[model samples]
Target: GTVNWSVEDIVKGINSNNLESQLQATQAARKLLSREKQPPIDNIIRAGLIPKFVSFLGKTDCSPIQFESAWALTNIASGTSEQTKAVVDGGAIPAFISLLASPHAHISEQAVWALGNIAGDGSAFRDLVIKHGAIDPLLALLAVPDLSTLACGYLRNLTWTLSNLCRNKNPAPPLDAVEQILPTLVRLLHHNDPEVLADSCWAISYLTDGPNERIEMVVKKGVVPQLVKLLGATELPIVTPALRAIGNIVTGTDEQTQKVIDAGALAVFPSLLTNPKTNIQKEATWTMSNITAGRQDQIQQVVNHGLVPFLVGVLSKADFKTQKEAAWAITNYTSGGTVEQIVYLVHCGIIEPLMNLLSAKDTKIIQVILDAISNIFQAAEKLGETEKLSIMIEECGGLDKIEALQRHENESVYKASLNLIEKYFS
Candidate 1:
């Protein structure tokens, strides 16, 4: 391909004073960049096409050149990290960011797509996009009628770019930057388009997924109630990210978790447990896991909401991962719950599947199951219900299964089995 035309001819065409020549050369390069199997990109980088494209991005009057150049660079950004670095190092980012304000909608849209690809490459390039002042311009596009209009797809691309920028943990924009734009992002959650709503929720998810300090920032932005509302959306696209964002929020301190619970997350969680999509069920289960880890009153809040039956049901028939999440939820409740809460679990039929898990080969699963069993038995002892619990365990064949673990290769399982045997069976 390099032999088809001299690199000098291509360079001269791009540099020509005649606008027609420059447009033709850039268009040709755009075609090359668009190919599914492209020419060696390192060769293009070596031929100085990167900076040339960056130069075209700066031309305001030449809309064709700008669009073609941005389109070309967009493809280049899709290359390896090193090729993407070539575009970034060529200084195209600020010029491309300025094009977000371009009168040419195609130019602006292509620029957003280009930046999204660069940011999606990895955290380092993502931080570079943010450092070059991409956020304010990108967020400003939300107010532009042409971009935000539901009939047009520009707003979707803009929000999707924002989602990619916020996806990772490494050196995200500082909390104040996030707080400043959070209300705008939250407002997008109500967009009628499922894709737009999904991207908006994804941005919130990534922002809140950081340190406790960042989580509190989003909470203070009043995102909990809005996110809770999204859970009721019938579209899985919207509900998935909404649950993910809410899930991260609940993982915060007791006050933070309580905020979500108060926003009606607990009320909807039971239905979510039976969602046809196993992933949704897992996320809801994980959220319940964190809720159970809260203070005694918070744990009781879940119990009082009547989720214990759903928890036991998930443990009984769900797939391995969902079952594990249910088991983990029970582990927290049993280890941290009040004696009455433990009794409520037994009343709700938690002991059966828990005993079934004793034969699981996963050491972690066995450990958590054992820990919950130990805590439940201890709670029964404290409440003078040990005899009742002993009868339930025997009726479910739990004593036989647990005794089989006495010879388990894991020392923890063996010790746990020994502890239960000495305390209850012996």
Candidate 2:
């Protein structure tokens, strides 16, 4: 499986007028560049034959030479930027475009894999592939009959390529890029293959990840319930993106969020709020924060899910990122819930953690905690427990904390803390 051909034989073979010699040499290039560890990428790049592989794949005879060249370029493009730059520098992106729709399964599959490597490189190269009109034919590749060849497994890779086309937003992808594939993305939600479903959910996740229009589009595409079901998917790959897509969906209008909860999303809360992965916990905390920011029953539904304990626990001990979202969840509940929820929150031992936030340097976090404390005091006044609540806060060292905020630098932070103290502690 190793290439014994010397570099001299390799270069001589590719430059020969004989097509037979070119095939063996290109096959040799593919073999040498595809090694699992430390492939001869730099060696091959310095040989100045990168352009020759792209030229060979462009051959209209489209037989072994075409497939071998496409395969070689695919491996070549998979290398780091130094090597990938050679493929793009040699104009391989344009060459790979036509082969995406090739009638032969291996040829089209090789082309898709090649383009995958290129687009996966970065945004500039990705958009270059997109601008060359890659999307139209790549979508066509999915329309082929159930290709049972090794190409058959390209389903996941092709979908993964589609995911990259819409993701990695240094400049962000265009909405026009999203609109073209969104319906296909939604349709792919029902794919029988789990890997395809995982990639499909990720593409949809990024598509819905930004603002209102894409969220409205995905909800109207009628996939929220499917996304809700996927929240409980046994595989983390499927659940992670599905959770992300649902989280993005809930960030839309209240009606949009209710639709997710209405679809039985609330039922999945137990597993998620306690997910073993900290990353999953952070996103789930974010998702719940938005839901709690909605109407009363929505907030009540979260309480009923027995998720409050885990959420307050997150605020008490999770990493700063996860705790930030947990803080919002508790704050939103404080802002919107009836008096009973506040008492339940305090009884759950949230006050010490809520005031512990006072030491943090983030301006918004300080304001949020101050505002949350004020909301709890407002609840206490209505319950005629203001004295008791004030004593609880003062005893927890919260009284001195609010006093400390008077000397804080941010104007809004000072005013918010003063407002809380004048109204309650005064």
Candidate 3:
């Protein structure tokens, strides 16, 4: 038996020649694929299906039956993990590219998602997707005023997918492509829709994952003021993503850091830590941590804004995640160690809670604490002060508690504590 129906019948269902049959059949196929979960399609590619699906995509005359059927086929063809490979393998990249220009947002969205996903998995489709005018559609969709929710979500998902694709440090994107996207993304920081703004920010963030000349190119677009504004916007639920985007851009770049500071990003962060919303506080704390990573002078700005009490309040809350973030942020702020900030941190008993964090299961917390310890030593050297070491020893329960941390199940804490012990002896 040739399964339940021939390929022609499935195609007709997609075409709406057979309306009722299409829905039942599409649903069944979805279930079968769900249950069996076949490995992605192999080299045996299908070219004919590409045009068939694309033809059905924008045909207004096509019955909803046909429209949905075509959509289902397109979804299956482009949406499947294996189908993505099949599309690329079958040399149907041009057909997939054609769909990007389709007037129908749904079709374009799907194409963007498919191509973004394919790009994430492998570079095989990268050239084709870019060549096929995908960027224009994505950018057009981004630029359209009063974007639909589906369109907003589509862009976010696509950008997120693209973000993953750009993870590798090398194989850099073309300067022109970077130039085109960065300017528009920077402008999008001012978009009326927070959803779109957040997605756009994230897309740019992911694209500029590291500090390099490319990021400098992006900075030339002048996004710092807008980014800082987003950082402080209370009505926007999407603030965290923007903060993360800023974090990605400035993490290791001195030039980027100065731009962020000049834009007053450093001034807004402590206030976010004091925000009533827990997620905002968490994100602000993390962003503050990242922005102030190695910049000691910024600590005065942080401490001046009453970060110590705000952090203590968060620590007193029951949310472990929030407390962890507060602890991490404290570590970062204290990392650069202005003597006054260090004295404030020790006096507030922040070091004790941090030492306690070493016992938690989260390795990030442990590593952050360890890094802060190293920073403290560096700070001590700069200020020519040994009192910080004594204060750390006393406030963090002295050498005894640290020795105990060395015996914990967490390897990072053990290693970190051992390292601290070595520093003490040396």
Span of 10 residues, lowest total lDDT, candidate 3 = 39-48
lDDT of 3 by residue, 231-296 (tens): 777655467766766776666576677787778776676567667777777766666666556566
Q: Quantify how close model 1 is to the true structure by its C-alpha RMSD in Å.
A: 2.9
RMSD of 3: 6.5
Q: Could you tell me which residue pairs clash in candidate 3?
A: none
C-alpha positional error of residue 110 in candidate 1 after TM-score superposition, expressed in Å: 1.9
In candidate 2, which residue pairs clash?
A: none
Question: Residue by residue across 69-89, what tens digits does model 1's lDDT show?
Answer: 999899888888888888899
Q: Least accurate stretch of 10 residues (summed lDDT) in model 1?
A: 143-152
Off by over 4 Å in 1: 1-18, 35-43, 144-151
* Full-model lDDT for every candidate: 0.85, 0.84, 0.60
What's the true lDDT of residue 217 in model 3?
76
Q: Rank the candidates by TM-score, best first.
A: 1, 2, 3
After superposition, the stretches of candidate 2 with alpha carbons farther than 4 Å from their true spots are 1-9, 81-85, 144-152, 170-177, 338-340, 359-364, 407-415
TM-score of predicted structure 1: 0.91
